[PDB]
């Protein structure tokens, strides 16, 4: 087709016919697999070999499309690439190829007898090549490539760009596709066996390179360099060669920022504010420049020489800090694939979970008080790193002992108890004992504890857990390895719960941690933005390689002594099956056996410490049951991060106290640890800071950790957020729009479009051009997520087609004999993407009736019920305020097809699918299990709440099931049970319940309007007065503080208008949050608040029964009383907008900050909640329409129906 020669290709606006054509053509590319092969491949496209354009700054750069010979003509399969051991018990120890090797896709044959070791190995390589390469997030992989190619075609208006030549050179094999993925077989079927083996992943690689071109990160010549690099990496083995130079091609930027040598940067305050700009040298110290020689040598002898030439070009031709940021983002796009890296876990086990000893050994502390089986109860270090850690960690034990005593631990264990998967699976004896529905539901963890609640107080439960092995489970993550992680059962989780409780209480007593301090916005980077605007600073992101694996048993003993000191000082009886008693004991010096009083928590901690077995046991399909060597951290426990946080802060602060005791100063200001990520910030002269950094790295080496010293003057890394000189450098290639880890491929479509919106919002202040990413998201939502197949009963098939085909198209299938129900699709119009509870995507200029277009919705626009305003905005509100009408102009909304979209939203498919699953779970067994589960902690409260609920039911109407506190455990078990299956005649009743709603809905449909959307109508007029820019518009013009914050951009100008985010300036907080949503925490359309308000307008003496049946505290009682009194008096208006904190990453949350930009006449304040309401109006309009905001002052005109609605 010719999809780059449309009206939308040259105007980018939705007129009457441009919208019709772009709906006709994208529905062509979604339905048939014949037109996609014609779209991606056609003889009108002429291939290019040499090419020339500009790089990411404007410098001319030349490149050449070079396919290697190893991708075009692959070799035959070599069985020596995956060897085995001599006994054939596992793969070889030092085997090279840890991932999929490039070979010919038909060369992997299986000529062995079944039930043979080599037959198992070749069946598992079949499983790797055909199944573990399909990872698509939204649609089929050839539909996710047509979206990228179509978006590039409509943006650049041509076809002679090199990514089309890469598509044609790599995938035009015959008159069909080389391969396809089938959801029926859950694997990829190769049509041409002569194609390569890694070749199905280059679909996702081409999708990611096109996403980076849409980002503004790569140009077309840089896309040639990137695709040459990714085809060079697949010459031997793709993932191995990617991981081998994964950090070499990134860490050059420190040298480029050195060779710039002069930067004018923003200056950040102590209070999250831009207060100045300064000019300073970026020249690194003498000990940093000595690493540049080694990195130059390794960069010269490892990389592909075109990419090495590009890195030397970036080091040589960069003049400012922005040039270094642009080349660094381009090399991030050239080194990362944007795919999830996965193979067989029998391959990646020995490199992801195998324990290792890197540095010197760790010794033991002297046991001072010992069990009668000679286990340790109390122990203290003589000298080494243990004394160093304990000299800091032994001044908090006396306070954590007080904090742990005021915690009811059985209620903490029930609240901690998740609906995730437990370790062990019930065998046939217990499956015969409990019912069949319970045995089906027992893949949860809370149902598991409710089954085995009879022996929670029995001590042999713990020893029964030591007979069961620990299951291994895979993960997938972009840019990193596979990370085989552990999953352990209820009792091994229960042993590690009290050290989790003890080590968690350290977070409230200092500021070394980062667990409780995140928000999703620029408060995550407050410390890094503040401590890079200073001088005489040394910044340090020390890299502990393999924190989970390098921790031996004797390294865990450093945490064990801290836990045993806190447990010996406290007094906690009745933790689990353990209780306080006079316990016979051995001491030091005492020849005989003493007797001391040992509480329950210290028994649990000592038995957890002295019975340690880490080794995960994966059951393979090749070798049977594969185990691991002992000595890893178990990494699936409850204390899997508090351990690392406490241990690292103990080592660092103990080094600080040891240096203070050795006569040396300490110049360390802050550390921030989340486990495996330390961030050290020093301040002083170069000798002092370098000495303290070398001492910290050496004392981490003393504890048995291979560190990588990554320290500098101007850059800092913590939790994958780079801050270089008061400036965020986002990682845009870490977000994978096209690949997916779990590969559920969710059967829900509104949820899929919400997932796409979440990813697109997370790619906002790390992308360089958000308009191209908007257009990419539009075409992926308009090609990938159109059609929706559901199974419809045979007696209702043509009836549902005849009811539904009146507004949008539908797709039919074959009638399928020897079965009952056949499936049918639900291809939808493009106006579903723009509506509330539909797509909720930022729209394009729609032409009105009068020829004037709608305004271009930016990337900062709201979502939720605010998106209903597009109906009135295309219905010409400017005419509505002067005609004094609320006529929605349904004819134009039928010309654009909004009415069928709102019809499909009003069908409400997913709620019916969920309710027919809810209509099966038997409440008798759920009640029995949760009554068995209530008996573990905090008795009397559930029964008192249920007594108050039955009392309010007998002297009132009713209360619902979830909202009552006594039924919340029953509700959580029942909701964990219903998420199990959908396999059967529940689908027939899906087809039945969806049949009766479409009979009632498709008589005749016209758009219903409330009185409550009379406040959606309103407009703004542009005056001639230019507003004044915030004074940090001159400070943030040099060295933009994100990739789209550049001088003149929409993010920069919105930041210059609205200003930064503030935590102190909460001008209007009650009214804004109340008409947005919650009064304090309880939202208005929340069933707690709705049932409470229904009781509130009833007899008010029932509130004494209500607050006991819900079991709210006195402050929550006062909050609900004030919420009732505020919802009755003038809680009648509400607006319901949604803005995500990642979407406004530097901008302000508070709508008050847009008051200085809009002149509202004072004859419109006729109610006490007009000011906050109008500030919401002006704030959302100024964020929605930044792209045409040249800087004039606005003026809000209103509608008389709006004023009459606000009055009453």
């Amino acid at each position: 087709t010719e999809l780059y020669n449309t009206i939308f290709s040259e105007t980018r606006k939705f007129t009457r016919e441009s919208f019709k054509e772009i709906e006709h053509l994208t529905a062509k590319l979604a339905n048939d697999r014949v037109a996609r092969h014609d779209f991606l491949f056609n003889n009108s496209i002429a291939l290019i070999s040499d090419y020339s354009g500009e790089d990411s700054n404007g410098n001319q750069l030349q490149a050449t499309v070079t396919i290697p010979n190893e991708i075009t003509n692959p070799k035959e399969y070599d069985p020596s690439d995956y060897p085995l051991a001599e006994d054939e018990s596992f793969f070889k120890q030092g085997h090279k190829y840890d991932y999929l090797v490039t070979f010919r896709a038909g060369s992997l044959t299986n000529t062995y007898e079944p039930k043979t070791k080599m037959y198992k190995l070749h069946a598992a390589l079949d499983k790797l090549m055909h199944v573990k390469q399909r990872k698509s997030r939204f649609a089929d992989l050839w539909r996710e490539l047509c979206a990228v190619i179509a978006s590039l075609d409509v943006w650049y208006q041509t076809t002679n760009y090199p990514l089309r030549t890469y598509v044609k050179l790599l995938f035009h094999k015959g008159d069909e596709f080389p391969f396809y993925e089938s959801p029926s077989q859950d694997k990829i079927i190769f049509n041409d066996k002569s194609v390569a083996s890694i070749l199905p992943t280059f679909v996702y690689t081409c999708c990611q390179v096109g996403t980076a071109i849409m980002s503004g990160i790569l140009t077309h010549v840089e896309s040639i360099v990137a695709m040459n690099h990714f085809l060079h990496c697949a010459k031997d083995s793709y993932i191995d060669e990617k991981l081998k130079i994964k950090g070499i091609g990134r860490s050059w930027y420190q040298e480029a920022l050195h060779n710039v040598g002069r930067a004018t940067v923003p200056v950040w305050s102590q209070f999250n504010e831009v207060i100045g700009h300064r000019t300073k040298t970026t020249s690194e110290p003498h000990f940093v420049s000595s690493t540049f020689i080694s990195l130059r040598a390794k960069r010269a002898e490892l990389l592909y020489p075109e990419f090495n030439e590009y890195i030397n070009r970036a080091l040589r031709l960069s003049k400012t800090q922005n040039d270094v940021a642009n080349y660094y983002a381009a090399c991030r796009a050239m080194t990362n694939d944007g795919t999830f890296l996965a193979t067989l876990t029998e391959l990646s086990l020995d490199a992801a979970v195998f324990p290792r000893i890197e540095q010197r050994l760790v010794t033991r502390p002297a046991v001072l008080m010992s069990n009668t089986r000679h286990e340790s109860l109390k122990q203290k270090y003589a000298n080494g790193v243990g004394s160093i850690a304990q000299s800091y960690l032994s001044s908090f034990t006396d306070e954590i002992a007080k904090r742990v005593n005021g915690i009811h631990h059985d209620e903490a264990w029930l609240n901690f108890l998740t609906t995730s998967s437990p370790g062990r699976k019930l065998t046939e004896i217990e499956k015969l004992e409990v019912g069949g529905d319970v045995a089906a539901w027992s893949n949860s963890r809370i149902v598991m504890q409710a089954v085995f609640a009879r022996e929670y107080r029995t001590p042999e439960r713990i020893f029964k857990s030591l007979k069961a092995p620990i299951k291994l489970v895979e993960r997938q993550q972009s840019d990193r390895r596979q990370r085989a992680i552990s999953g352990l059962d209820n009792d091994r989780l229960f042993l590690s719960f009290m050290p989790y409780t003890i080590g968690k209480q350290i977070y409230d007593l200092n500021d070394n941690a980062a667990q409780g301090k995140q928000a999703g916005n620029a408060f995550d980077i407050g410390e890094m933005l503040y401590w890079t605007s200073q001088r005489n600073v040394l910044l340090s992101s020390i890299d502990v390689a393999g924190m989970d694996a390098s921790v031996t048993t004797n390294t865990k003993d450093i945490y064990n002594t801290f836990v045993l000191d806190v447990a010996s000082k406290c007094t906690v009886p009745r933790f689990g099956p353990y209780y306080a008693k006079n316990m016979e004991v051995f001491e030091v010096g005492k020849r005989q056996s003493q007797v001391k009083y040992v509480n329950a928590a210290w028994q649990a901690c000592a038995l957890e410490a002295a019975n340690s077995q880490t080794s995960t046991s994966y059951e393979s399909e090749i070798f049977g049951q594969v185990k691991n060597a002992e000595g890893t951290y178990p990494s699936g426990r409850a204390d899997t991060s508090t351990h690392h946080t406490v241990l690292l802060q103990g080592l660092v602060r103990g080094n600080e106290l040891k240096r203070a005791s050795d006569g040396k100063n300490s110049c360390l200001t802050t550390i921030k640890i989340l486990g495996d990520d330390i961030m050290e910030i020093f301040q002083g002269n170069e000798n002092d800071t370098h000495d303290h950094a070398v001492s910290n790295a050496s004392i981490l080496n003393e504890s048995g950790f291979a560190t990588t010293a990554e320290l500098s003057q101007n850059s800092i890394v913590l939790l994958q957020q780079l801050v270089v000189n008061g400036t965020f450098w986002g990682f845009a290639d870490r977000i994978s729009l096209w690949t997916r880890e779990d590969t559920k491929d969710i059967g829900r479509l509104n949820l899929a479009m919400m997932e796409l919106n979440a990813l697109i919002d997370d790619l906002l202040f790390r992308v360089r051009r958000p308009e191209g990413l908007k257009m990419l998201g539009f075409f992926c939502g308009a090609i990938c997520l159109r059609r929706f197949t559901l199974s419809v009963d045979n007696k209702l098939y043509d009836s549902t087609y005849n009811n539904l085909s009146k507004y949008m198209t539908l797709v039919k299938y074959d009638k399928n004999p020897d079965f009952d129900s056949t499936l049918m699709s639900l291809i939808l119009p493009l106006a579903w993407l723009f509506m509330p509870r539909g797509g909720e995507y930022p729209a394009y200029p729609f032409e009105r009736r009068d020829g004037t277009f709608t305004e271009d919705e930016s990337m900062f626009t709201a979502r939720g019920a605010y998106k209903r305003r597009l109906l009135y905005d295309v219905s010409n509100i400017r005419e509505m305020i002067q005609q004094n009408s609320m006529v929605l102009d349904d004819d134009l909304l039928h010309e654009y097809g909004f009415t069928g979209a709102l019809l499909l939203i009003d069908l409400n498919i997913l709620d019916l699918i969920d309710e027919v699953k809810k209509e099966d779970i038997s409440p008798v067994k759920v009640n029995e299990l949760a009554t068995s589960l209530e008996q573990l902690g905090k008795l009397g409260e559930r029964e008192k709440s249920r007594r108050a609920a039955s009392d309010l039911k007998i002297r009132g109407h009713a209360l619902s099931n979830d909202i009552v506190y006594g039924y919340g455990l029953q509700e959580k078990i029942q909701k964990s049970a219903m998420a199990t299956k959908e396999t059967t005649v529940q689908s027939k009743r899906v087809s039945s319940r969806l049949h009766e709603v479409i009979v009632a809905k498709t008589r005749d449909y016209k758009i219903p309007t409330m009185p409550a959307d009379a406040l959606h109508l309103y407009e703004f007029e542009v005056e001639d007065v230019t507003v004044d820019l915030l004074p940090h518009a001159k400070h943030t013009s040099y060295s933009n503080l994100a990739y789209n914050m550049s001088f003149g951009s929409d993010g920069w100008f919105a930041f210059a208008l609205l200003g930064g985010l503030d935590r102190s300036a909460n001008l209007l907080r009650l009214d804004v949050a109340s008409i947005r949503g919650n009064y304090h925490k309880f939202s208005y359309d929340d069933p707690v608040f709705k049932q409470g308000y229904k009781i509130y307008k009833s007899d008010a003496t029932l509130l004494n029964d209500f607050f006991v049946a819900i079991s709210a505290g006195p402050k929550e009682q006062g909050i609900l009383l004030r919420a009732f009194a505020y919802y009755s008096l003038y809680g009648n208006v509400e607006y319901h907008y949604v803005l995500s904190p990642r979407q406004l990453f530097f901008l302000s949350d508070n709508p008050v900050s847009a008051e200085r930009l809009v002149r509202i006449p004072p004859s419109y304040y006729v109610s006490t909640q007009c000011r906050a309401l109008y500030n919401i109006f002006s704030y959302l309009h100024i964020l929605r329409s930044i792209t045409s905001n040249q800087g004039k002052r606005l003026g809000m005109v209103l509608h008389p129906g709006l004023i009459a609605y606000v009055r009453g």
């Binding site: 001599e86 006994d87 054939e88 018990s89 324990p355 290792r356 000893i357 010197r360 050994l361 010794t363 033991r364 010992s370 089986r373 286990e375 003589a382 000298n383 609640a453 009879r454 107080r457 029995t458 001590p459 042999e460 020893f463 030591l466 007979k467 092995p469 620990i470 031996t552 048993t553 004797n554 865990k556 003993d557 064990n560 009745r574 209780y579 008693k581 005492k590 020849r591 005989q592 056996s593 002295a610 019975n611 340690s612 077995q613 080794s615 046991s617 059951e619 049977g624 049951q625 594969v626 185990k627 691991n628 060597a629 002992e630 000595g631 029995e928 009554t931 068995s932 008996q935 009397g940």
Partner: protein, 501 residues
Amino acid sequence: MFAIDPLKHSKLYEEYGLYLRPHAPTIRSIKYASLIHSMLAKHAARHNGTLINPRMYADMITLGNTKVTVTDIVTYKALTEMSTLIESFRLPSGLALIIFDDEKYQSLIPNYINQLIAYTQPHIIPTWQGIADFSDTYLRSYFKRPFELTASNLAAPQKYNLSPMTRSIFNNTGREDAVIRKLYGYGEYVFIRYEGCLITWTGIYGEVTMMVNLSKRDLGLDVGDDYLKEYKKLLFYGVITDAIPSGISARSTIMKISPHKMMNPSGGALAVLSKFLEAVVSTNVINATLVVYAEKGAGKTSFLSTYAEQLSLASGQVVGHLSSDAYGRWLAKNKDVEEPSFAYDYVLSLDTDDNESYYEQKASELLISHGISEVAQYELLSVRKKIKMMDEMNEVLIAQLENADTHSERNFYYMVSTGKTTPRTLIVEGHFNAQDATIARTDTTVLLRTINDTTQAMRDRQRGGVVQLFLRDTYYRLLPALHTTVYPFEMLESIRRWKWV
């Protein structure tokens, strides 16, 4: 009210030496507690083995104040039944729940009693060496108080004020029970029977107790015998119950032997060993391996050879055994050969005690380099002077645990554990916990404790006692008790209890 009901489970209390006084307020109280146990066992079995309101049951039984009477009924029907039972007792107070401080007793407490413990102040009776003391209130009221006959205490029962209905007899005379019974007139009485022994030795620092799982006829020892006499039975079945270092040595003689209760094996030890035996039996696992750590001088090879023999005879397979100093005696001969032989017969041919270890050579050179050549010179140092040398010995240990070269320890155990001709199941020994990442991949690893003062056993042997004591102290400094502590009788009971075929 005990935790385990003495009227139903009378034989378990007979095992502790606690006999029921024949059938008064205590006689009424024990029957009332038995009826309470039957009522709780009935109420537990109607709701998934749990009790519906355990604080209410605990108050009504232990405190004896709450009365529930119907004058919902369904939720409180069990409590009304328990209330009408307890109200018919007319006790002045409540029946206190009574637990012993033994491990074998707590594993046999029922589930409903364990649910009531968490809302009750129990009466926890201590144990001396497993026997609960007889000078308590409840064990004097409900049971027969024992009376011990010795060589000096031996007389007719008319001489003391003994009686069949109050006192039971503990024969500690070293004579047959029939001779005491029909020679002195103890025929109407009843004897408590114990199956093990309790031996007091003459230690270096004091006197040392020992508990053995053999009868006094099975264990051929009398008062005044020797430690090296019948050493194998003591190593296989004995546990010293004193603080280590307990100065036991090859010169210690017997002061006293008394009949005493057999020790009960631990839960976690038998759990980890049955996990290993499940790995041995199942066809799903290609290589089974047990990792055993012990201090250097615990006599671990002599027992684990017997363990490999018993496992081979009971399982029908071939069980190998790699010694603790296997890698050192291998590397002493093969550190110069670039391409050595990793075969199992060549490794097993070098585990004899005449081959010199590599680590003993390096530690010999390290002790020479400080001028330490006699044991008295090493004893006369300070602790910091020892630790300064042990850190250099750790510097020479780390070079073989750091990487995987062609002579690394991890490569050695990889090549022996994954050979063509090697046995399937290996019992591999080790010295210190940093070898967990190096010794072959398992899911069972234990720690072995025997009756050997390992700092005394290494100064009582030739061939360089300085190096042996130094390496013992270094390996102790790298070995906490952070895996499951296992005694040798537990390792034999693991095979005796696991059912084969």
